[PDB]
């Protein structure tokens, strides 16, 4: 499957993401400059907030159960599992 991932912050664009591609990688192929540092699921730099839809970010490690429950997603290690809508650049909300 290929899912429509809407990325919002002067950013408002919907990209196509195969279910076996990470959202950050797909955003970069679409020319979108999203924040990152480790690209390995171990920090908050690439954090976004899921507004609708679902992801598989099982390779992540930084976010705790409670941050995941609140809708945070580490875009560098997140695969879409449905069409979804993500607010980007959300690291600041964790602190
Ligand atoms: S850039 Fe570090 S977790 Fe995504």
Swiss-Prot record:
Cofactor dependency: [2Fe-2S] cluster
GO BP field: electron transport chain
UniProt cross-references to SUPFAM superfamilies, sorted A to Z: 2Fe-2S ferredoxin-like (SSF54292)
Domain called 2Fe-2S ferredoxin-type: residue spans: 3-92
PANTHER family, alphabetized: FERREDOXIN (PTHR43112), FERREDOXIN-2, CHLOROPLASTIC (PTHR43112:SF3)
NCBIfam families associated with the record: fdx_plant
Function, in words: Ferredoxins are iron-sulfur proteins that transfer electrons in a wide variety of metabolic reactions.
Protein family according to the UniProt entry: Belongs to the 2Fe2S plant-type ferredoxin family.
Protein name as it appears in the record: Ferredoxin
Name of encoding gene: petF
């Amino acid at each position: 499957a290929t899912y429509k991932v809407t990325l919002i912050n002067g950013l408002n664009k919907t990209i196509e993401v195969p279910d076996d591609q990470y959202i950050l990688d797909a955003a970069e192929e679409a020319g979108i400059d999203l924040p990152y540092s480790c690209r390995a699921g171990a920090c908050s730099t690439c954090a976004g907030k899921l507004i609708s839809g679902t992801v598989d970010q099982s390779d992540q490690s930084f976010l705790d159960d409670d941050q995941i429950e609140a809708g945070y997603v580490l875009t560098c290690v997140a695969y879409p599992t449905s069409d979804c809508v993500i607010e980007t650049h959300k690291e600041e909300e964790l602190y």
